[PDB]
Design an enzyme around this catalytic site. Structure first.
Site, PDB file in Angstrom:
ATOM      1  N   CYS B  57       0.803  -1.226   0.000  1.00  0.00           N
ATOM      2  CA  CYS B  57       0.000   0.000   0.000  1.00  0.00           C
ATOM      3  C   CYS B  57       0.835   1.276   0.000  1.00  0.00           C
ATOM      4  CB  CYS B  57      -0.935   0.024   1.214  1.00  0.00           C
ATOM      5  SG  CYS B  57      -1.628  -1.600   1.653  1.00  0.00           S
ATOM      6  N   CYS B  60       1.802   3.451  -3.294  1.00  0.00           N
ATOM      7  CA  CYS B  60       0.847   4.428  -3.803  1.00  0.00           C
ATOM      8  C   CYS B  60       0.404   5.446  -2.766  1.00  0.00           C
ATOM      9  CB  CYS B  60      -0.395   3.735  -4.360  1.00  0.00           C
ATOM     10  SG  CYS B  60      -0.087   2.640  -5.776  1.00  0.00           S
ATOM     11  N   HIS B  61       0.293   5.016  -1.513  1.00  0.00           N
ATOM     12  CA  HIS B  61      -0.188   5.894  -0.450  1.00  0.00           C
ATOM     13  C   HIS B  61       0.879   6.546   0.421  1.00  0.00           C
ATOM     14  CE1 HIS B  61      -4.425   5.119  -1.316  1.00  0.00           C
ATOM     15  NE2 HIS B  61      -4.186   3.825  -1.394  1.00  0.00           N
ATOM     16  N   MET B  98       4.228  -5.821  -9.325  1.00  0.00           N
ATOM     17  CA  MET B  98       4.990  -6.321 -10.466  1.00  0.00           C
ATOM     18  C   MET B  98       4.948  -7.840 -10.542  1.00  0.00           C
ATOM     19  SD  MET B  98       6.142  -3.796 -12.234  1.00  0.00           S
ATOM     20  CE  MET B  98       7.672  -3.985 -13.176  1.00  0.00           C
ATOM     21  N   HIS B 337      10.271   9.963 -13.044  1.00  0.00           N
ATOM     22  CA  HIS B 337      10.765   8.635 -12.769  1.00  0.00           C
ATOM     23  C   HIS B 337      12.103   8.373 -13.449  1.00  0.00           C
ATOM     24  CE1 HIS B 337      10.655   4.724 -11.134  1.00  0.00           C
ATOM     25  NE2 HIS B 337      10.777   4.163 -12.323  1.00  0.00           N
ATOM     26  N   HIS B 380       7.462   5.023 -20.075  1.00  0.00           N
ATOM     27  CA  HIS B 380       8.495   4.401 -19.250  1.00  0.00           C
ATOM     28  C   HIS B 380       9.640   4.115 -20.217  1.00  0.00           C
ATOM     29  CE1 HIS B 380      10.740   1.406 -16.940  1.00  0.00           C
ATOM     30  NE2 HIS B 380      10.148   1.914 -15.869  1.00  0.00           N
TER      31      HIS B 380
HETATM   32  C1  DHE Z   1      14.102   4.580  -9.700  1.00  0.00           C
HETATM   33  C2  DHE Z   1      14.213   3.417 -10.630  1.00  0.00           C
HETATM   34  C3  DHE Z   1      15.077   3.243 -11.697  1.00  0.00           C
HETATM   35  C4  DHE Z   1      16.174   4.173 -12.158  1.00  0.00           C
HETATM   36  C5  DHE Z   1      17.498   3.757 -11.695  1.00  0.00           C
HETATM   37  C6  DHE Z   1      18.647   4.637 -11.944  1.00  0.00           C
HETATM   38  O1  DHE Z   1      18.461   5.729 -12.536  1.00  0.00           O
HETATM   39  O2  DHE Z   1      19.780   4.266 -11.545  1.00  0.00           O
HETATM   40  C7  DHE Z   1      14.785   1.980 -12.277  1.00  0.00           C
HETATM   41  C8  DHE Z   1      15.420   1.370 -13.352  1.00  0.00           C
HETATM   42  C9  DHE Z   1      15.390   0.043 -13.744  1.00  0.00           C
HETATM   43  C10 DHE Z   1      16.145  -0.573 -14.785  1.00  0.00           C
HETATM   44  C11 DHE Z   1      17.090   0.139 -15.665  1.00  0.00           C
HETATM   45  C12 DHE Z   1      17.297  -0.061 -16.916  1.00  0.00           C
HETATM   46  C13 DHE Z   1      18.162   0.747 -17.783  1.00  0.00           C
HETATM   47  O3  DHE Z   1      18.416   0.330 -18.928  1.00  0.00           O
HETATM   48  O4  DHE Z   1      18.613   1.822 -17.343  1.00  0.00           O
HETATM   49  C14 DHE Z   1      15.841  -1.912 -14.778  1.00  0.00           C
HETATM   50  C15 DHE Z   1      16.432  -3.002 -15.610  1.00  0.00           C
HETATM   51  C16 DHE Z   1      14.816  -2.119 -13.795  1.00  0.00           C
HETATM   52  C17 DHE Z   1      14.149  -3.304 -13.524  1.00  0.00           C
HETATM   53  C18 DHE Z   1      13.023  -3.488 -12.762  1.00  0.00           C
HETATM   54  N1  DHE Z   1      12.483  -2.551 -11.940  1.00  0.00           N
HETATM   55 FE1  DHE Z   1      13.107  -0.575 -11.742  1.00  0.00          FE
HETATM   56  N2  DHE Z   1      11.627  -0.250 -10.325  1.00  0.00           N
HETATM   57  C19 DHE Z   1      11.575   0.861  -9.544  1.00  0.00           C
HETATM   58  C20 DHE Z   1      12.441   1.935  -9.555  1.00  0.00           C
HETATM   59  C21 DHE Z   1      13.408   2.234 -10.518  1.00  0.00           C
HETATM   60  N3  DHE Z   1      13.745   1.397 -11.555  1.00  0.00           N
HETATM   61  C22 DHE Z   1      10.405   0.765  -8.646  1.00  0.00           C
HETATM   62  O5  DHE Z   1      10.117   1.515  -7.760  1.00  0.00           O
HETATM   63  C23 DHE Z   1       9.617  -0.465  -9.054  1.00  0.00           C
HETATM   64  C24 DHE Z   1       8.352   0.053  -9.883  1.00  0.00           C
HETATM   65  C25 DHE Z   1       9.126  -1.290  -7.923  1.00  0.00           C
HETATM   66  C26 DHE Z   1      10.067  -1.596  -6.841  1.00  0.00           C
HETATM   67  O6  DHE Z   1       9.603  -1.754  -5.684  1.00  0.00           O
HETATM   68  O7  DHE Z   1      11.285  -1.701  -7.103  1.00  0.00           O
HETATM   69  C27 DHE Z   1      10.613  -1.103 -10.009  1.00  0.00           C
HETATM   70  C28 DHE Z   1      10.510  -2.367 -10.502  1.00  0.00           C
HETATM   71  C29 DHE Z   1      11.336  -3.034 -11.357  1.00  0.00           C
HETATM   72  C30 DHE Z   1      11.107  -4.428 -11.771  1.00  0.00           C
HETATM   73  O8  DHE Z   1      10.203  -5.154 -11.419  1.00  0.00           O
HETATM   74  C31 DHE Z   1      12.221  -4.788 -12.738  1.00  0.00           C
HETATM   75  C32 DHE Z   1      11.527  -5.002 -14.172  1.00  0.00           C
HETATM   76  C33 DHE Z   1      12.984  -5.998 -12.338  1.00  0.00           C
HETATM   77  C34 DHE Z   1      13.832  -5.851 -11.132  1.00  0.00           C
HETATM   78  O9  DHE Z   1      15.039  -6.161 -11.198  1.00  0.00           O
HETATM   79  O10 DHE Z   1      13.319  -5.427 -10.080  1.00  0.00           O
HETATM   80  N4  DHE Z   1      14.590  -0.924 -13.155  1.00  0.00           N
HETATM   81  C1  HEM Z   2      -2.979  -1.772   0.486  1.00  0.00           C
HETATM   82  C2  HEM Z   2      -3.708  -3.086   0.744  1.00  0.00           C
HETATM   83  C3  HEM Z   2      -3.878  -0.559   0.248  1.00  0.00           C
HETATM   84  C4  HEM Z   2      -4.712  -0.011   1.163  1.00  0.00           C
HETATM   85  C5  HEM Z   2      -4.840  -0.419   2.635  1.00  0.00           C
HETATM   86  C6  HEM Z   2      -5.384   1.071   0.492  1.00  0.00           C
HETATM   87  C7  HEM Z   2      -6.410   1.792   1.055  1.00  0.00           C
HETATM   88  C8  HEM Z   2      -7.154   2.736   0.407  1.00  0.00           C
HETATM   89  C9  HEM Z   2      -8.347   3.331   0.970  1.00  0.00           C
HETATM   90  C10 HEM Z   2      -8.954   3.084   2.347  1.00  0.00           C
HETATM   91  C11 HEM Z   2      -8.845   4.123   0.022  1.00  0.00           C
HETATM   92  C12 HEM Z   2     -10.119   4.946   0.129  1.00  0.00           C
HETATM   93  C13 HEM Z   2      -9.800   6.343   0.658  1.00  0.00           C
HETATM   94  C14 HEM Z   2     -10.919   7.350   0.421  1.00  0.00           C
HETATM   95  O1  HEM Z   2     -11.962   6.993  -0.163  1.00  0.00           O
HETATM   96  O2  HEM Z   2     -10.742   8.523   0.813  1.00  0.00           O
HETATM   97  C15 HEM Z   2      -7.950   4.021  -1.137  1.00  0.00           C
HETATM   98  C16 HEM Z   2      -8.119   4.675  -2.342  1.00  0.00           C
HETATM   99  C17 HEM Z   2      -7.289   4.567  -3.450  1.00  0.00           C
HETATM  100  N1  HEM Z   2      -6.129   3.814  -3.474  1.00  0.00           N
HETATM  101 FE1  HEM Z   2      -5.517   2.529  -2.137  1.00  0.00          FE
HETATM  102  N2  HEM Z   2      -4.948   1.227  -0.826  1.00  0.00           N
HETATM  103  C18 HEM Z   2      -4.007   0.224  -0.967  1.00  0.00           C
HETATM  104  C19 HEM Z   2      -3.245   0.047  -2.115  1.00  0.00           C
HETATM  105  C20 HEM Z   2      -3.254   0.843  -3.232  1.00  0.00           C
HETATM  106  C21 HEM Z   2      -2.324   0.706  -4.356  1.00  0.00           C
HETATM  107  C22 HEM Z   2      -1.312  -0.405  -4.571  1.00  0.00           C
HETATM  108  C23 HEM Z   2      -2.562   1.783  -5.159  1.00  0.00           C
HETATM  109  C24 HEM Z   2      -1.758   2.258  -6.367  1.00  0.00           C
HETATM  110  C25 HEM Z   2      -1.808   1.400  -7.617  1.00  0.00           C
HETATM  111  C26 HEM Z   2      -3.692   2.499  -4.571  1.00  0.00           C
HETATM  112  C27 HEM Z   2      -4.386   3.538  -5.182  1.00  0.00           C
HETATM  113  C28 HEM Z   2      -5.550   4.119  -4.699  1.00  0.00           C
HETATM  114  C29 HEM Z   2      -6.381   5.020  -5.463  1.00  0.00           C
HETATM  115  C30 HEM Z   2      -6.095   5.542  -6.868  1.00  0.00           C
HETATM  116  C31 HEM Z   2      -7.469   5.299  -4.687  1.00  0.00           C
HETATM  117  C32 HEM Z   2      -8.633   6.236  -5.036  1.00  0.00           C
HETATM  118  C33 HEM Z   2      -8.422   7.698  -4.656  1.00  0.00           C
HETATM  119  C34 HEM Z   2      -7.312   8.355  -5.448  1.00  0.00           C
HETATM  120  O3  HEM Z   2      -6.217   8.558  -4.882  1.00  0.00           O
HETATM  121  O4  HEM Z   2      -7.527   8.664  -6.642  1.00  0.00           O
HETATM  122  N3  HEM Z   2      -4.073   1.931  -3.380  1.00  0.00           N
HETATM  123  N4  HEM Z   2      -6.931   3.141  -0.893  1.00  0.00           N
END
Ligand code: DHE
Ligand code: HEM
Ligand code: DHE
Lengths: 439, 559
Positions: B57, B60-61, B98, B337, B380
């Site tokens: 959670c 996103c939150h 993912m 990003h 991306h």
């Molecule tokens: C901030 C960031 C960068 C830039 C790095 C830099 O500039 O040095 C990056 C780059 C990358 C790059 C860079 C590629 C390049 O060519 O520069 C790769 C291969 C990659 C593979 C993945 N990333 Fe990444 N990635 C994140 C964050 C980032 N990824 C996340 O937050 C996310 C969405 C979820 C998480 O919790 O990590 C995420 C998931 C993934 C994957 O699931 C991938 C596909 C597989 C893995 O190894 O985790 N990220």
């Molecule tokens: C993780 C299991 C998780 C929780 C807990 C959570 C809660 C939550 C609540 C209670 C709301 C309603 C709030 C309101 O109505 O004021 C809410 C709403 C949104 N969420 Fe969420 N949420 C969890 C996970 C995630 C994840 C992984 C994402 C991102 C992909 C996400 C996103 C959102 C969105 C979008 C909403 C609607 C409101 C908005 O921000 O536009 N949540 N969540």
């Protein structure tokens, strides 16, 4: 119990408080009153939430204006047209001194607790911007110099300079303006960082974060207006920044306890050459630091002398280019007789031989003739010509207070200012000396 | 209406891409006190809910619940909503993370209650991680003075590939010509990316847990010569690339605490830590959790380029003086990003993904030059793909996670003025869920994956466009589909193909056939000239291969 973090105060909040009483297009294009603006004094009437604009030569109170509660300081735009005041509560009032009847043309709130404000002073940037600093939230805000519109808010939360640990409450202390670059000079207390903020581009914002010393509070520029000298008070140090090169130059212990310079006092010592002086809150000492690397290399950025004044509890030291005297108050001294007086040193007689220079004691509070309470004398401020120096005789809100004007040439009483409206007078700022940073 | 969770919390291709703070989630926390009107959770219950929150959670939150892509969920807000609302809303589940490691988004009835109760309690801010903590973690295994003065192994270092074996917390160093796995090194937790020092001697890897390892490629047997922890959650690292500053510094970015750290390029000694907490660029409101995303290095000035996500700020940090620190804080667009430099290495082009914008920064002048909508959903680019389009001139390309589009932006303000910083063309590739686009100066082909696509046929393939055949007449250029996963001959699971990376000569391009940790994966090498299968790398040690980085192309930013 776990502490609940107070509310933040961002753009939405600021803009809601932002009120433009008189739009730029509706203001005059030239001075429409007959006042001597540059010789005017803006005096804080602390507890009344007002300021008094006083004629520097006649001592007539030209006007009393409503402001934020307990205004901490008054600052003037570089042209001398606009007067900016900021209250403890973070309320800022912008006053147009050119109006037939000067008043607040715009106001805005920038935080919950604030103490500083300043105007842009780089040549070519006159009247362009104003900047305000807050204790809470930890932030500074750059505003339009004409309308007070909030343009850029910067959080000061961050890492301490030395131990490099995150600090969630780095209060903004003094804010000065560079005369060498289009930048604001911001002191961040708890983290010990001095920020040089370039206002030529607020979108692509250039800043220089200078690692200095913790507990930065007040300070001032040297006589050439090139070096910023500030007190890291709790650590008994003076930090020196080169505003031209944008870097730390020196950090020296004053040998005293808790230096509190205000903007300090710059003068040419007969033996040492150009120096800047500061008194202390923690003891009776006055310290001098050399400020001329080109002409007096051996004395530059070194504490050249330390000597006693009236006693501890001092807050402000003062002098002016046209004066041969160095004035030092003792506002917070527990002893009424001391807090009600000022020490005055004869700069011309200083030899720097290591002995303690003698000083004359001016019985400022006595001259004011106040019976009730034990009023505290605070902050000397010179008129534009640098021929007279004013002091506030600060008493309670329901007690009698006064402003005492001293003739600088003779060190004799010149005038006592009293008026029923003169409630809790504290800070006093001469328009010319403030707009030009003459101290 | 809790039923809103059906849309708000529905799993979509571009929303599976949210950080999972599983490392911070491992931290044990004490249960807070429950105010009047709310029921308390025991230490065990609160800890369980806290782990779930950080894992699925918080991305996103927010860790602090102040909101990121999802709105704020602080106690003042949730208590007004009430337990019943929260319970019903969360019951519909949350978006999946993912593939091959992310969450399913499904919670048990007990867990739903734990989460609803957790949200009503005051969140405790996780620990900070400053200089003391970093220095305590800092270890120099081989002092610079004791390392070799010349390459002591016989490897062709510039043609070497550093490959992330994600779930195992290891990296594989693979020969670019023989495809031999030269060595597999352990770092502990999953490595996110590999970066090279400008000289090509030092290999830097950053673990998702904030652990940084520095490897000396000149050793007879290359190993970690220094290590340090810089935070609790981190995803980025980079080396100094300004001429004259080779090997001087390395910088790492963190999600938590929100900060970046500049370290000595030889020993990893932590030199300067900078908090990213600050004001959002547009609404100018304080944000307590601005995550550091991509970090690149300027070739025009001795500066690092730092993306700060939630606040929408790009930072140009001058490393010539860390005491009198010069920085340029550029207001850009929120949700910054990833990104890359153009072919001339002067302009930084980055995706403000959630807002479908590409932000362009002039690294020479240190100012924002353009912000353009790609016309697609959630770009991306990775570091993107630069090439001289036959009719448009120099362009940089990016694919999208939210749709099948590939967008081209002109990158030549002096030579092709009208085309500069404008989206010159947009066309479909395989399908949505793309993560990386790739090309090389010696290639006439543009490769585009579709990793997150829900359809196996697509996620296991790559689209290849013939740059020489591009006319820029407004029509959609055709592409050949390479069956990468099929070429690797993997049966079990639904392997996803991800990230093309070229060898030093730009004659071959590699792709990862990413399968689960207890499943078979592979690396597929394609002959760029013929677009035919060249070689398939399979090894029991090749667990969850993802990111691949060729030493030469990474040290020189050739993409
Ligand atoms: C901030 C960031 C960068 C830039 C790095 C830099 O500039 O040095 C990056 C780059 C990358 C790059 C860079 C590629 C390049 O060519 O520069 C790769 C291969 C990659 C593979 C993945 N990333 Fe990444 N990635 C994140 C964050 C980032 N990824 C996340 O937050 C996310 C969405 C979820 C998480 O919790 O990590 C995420 C998931 C993934 C994957 O699931 C991938 C596909 C597989 C893995 O190894 O985790 N990220
Ligand atoms: C993780 C299991 C998780 C929780 C807990 C959570 C809660 C939550 C609540 C209670 C709301 C309603 C709030 C309101 O109505 O004021 C809410 C709403 C949104 N969420 Fe969420 N949420 C969890 C996970 C995630 C994840 C992984 C994402 C991102 C992909 C996400 C996103 C959102 C969105 C979008 C909403 C609607 C409101 C908005 O921000 O536009 N949540 N969540
Ligand atoms: C940060 C700061 C500045 C620099 C402003 C700038 O650069 O524009 C300043 C300057 C000042 C100046 C500047 C004078 C000058 O010549 O520049 C004055 C008059 C002044 C009157 C007072 N100050 Fe001040 N002051 C504080 C803060 C500050 N004071 C405090 O935190 C403190 C110690 C306690 C508090 O709670 O406010 C404090 C107490 C005082 C007083 O007691 C005074 C005498 C009256 C009052 O209302 O508080 N402060």
């Amino acid at each position: 119990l776990d502490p609940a973090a107070p509310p933040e105060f961002g753009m939405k909040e600021m803009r809601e408080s932002w009120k433009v009483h008189v739009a730029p297009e509706d203001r005059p294009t030239q001075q429409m009153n007959d006042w001597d603006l540059e010789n005017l004094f803006s005096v804080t009437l602390r507890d009344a939430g007002q300021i008094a604009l006083i004629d520097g030569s006649t001592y007539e109170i030209k006007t009393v204006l409503d402001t934020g509660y307990a205004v901490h300081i008054s600052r003037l735009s570089a042209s001398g047209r606009y007067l900016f005041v900021i209250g403890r509560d973070g309320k800022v009032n912008m006053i147009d001194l050119w109006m037939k009847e000067p008043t607040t043309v715009a106001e805005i709130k920038i935080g919950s607790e604030a103490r500083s404000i300043e105007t842009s002073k780089m040549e070519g940037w006159e009247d362009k911007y104003a900047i305000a600093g807050a204790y809470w939230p930890p932030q500074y805000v750059i505003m339009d110099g004409e309308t007070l519109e909030p343009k850029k808010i910067q959080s000061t939360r961050g890492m301490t300079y030395d131990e490099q640990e995150y600090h969630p409450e780095p209060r903004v202390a003094a804010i000065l303006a560079s005369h060498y670059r289009p930048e604001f000079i911001v002191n961040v207390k708890e983290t010990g960082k001095i920020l040089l903020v370039d206002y030529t581009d607020l979108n692509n914002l250039k800043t220089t974060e200078i690692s200095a010393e913790r507990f930065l509070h007040d300070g001032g520029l040297d006589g050439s207006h090139r070096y910023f000298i500030t007190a890291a008070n709790a650590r008994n140090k003076l930090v020196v920044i080169d505003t031209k090169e944008g870097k730390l130059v020196a950090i020296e212990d004053t040998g005293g306890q808790t230096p509190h310079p205000g903007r300090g006092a710059n003068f040419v010592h007969p033996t040492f050459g150009p120096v800047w002086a500061t008194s202390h809150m923690g003891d009776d000492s006055v310290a001098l630091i050399g400020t001329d690397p080109e002409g007096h290399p051996d004395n530059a950025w070194k504490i050249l002398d330390s000597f006693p004044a009236l006693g501890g509890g001092s807050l402000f030291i003062k002098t002016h280019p046209n004066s041969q005297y160095l004035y030092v108050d003792a506002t917070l001294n527990p002893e009424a007789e001391i807090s009600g007086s000022v020490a005055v040193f004869d700069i011309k007689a200083m030899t720097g031989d290591g002995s303690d220079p003698e000083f004359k004691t001016l019985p400022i509070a006595e001259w004011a003739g106040i019976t009730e309470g034990q009023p505290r004398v605070v902050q000397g401020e010179f008129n534009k010509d640098g021929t007279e120096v004013w002091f506030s005789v600060w008493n309670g809100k329901d007690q009698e207070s006064a402003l005492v004007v001293v003739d600088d040439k003779t060190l004799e009483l010149k005038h006592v200012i009293k008026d029923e409206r003169l409630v809790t007078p504290t800070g006093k700022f001469n328009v010319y000396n403030t707009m030009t940073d003459t101290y």
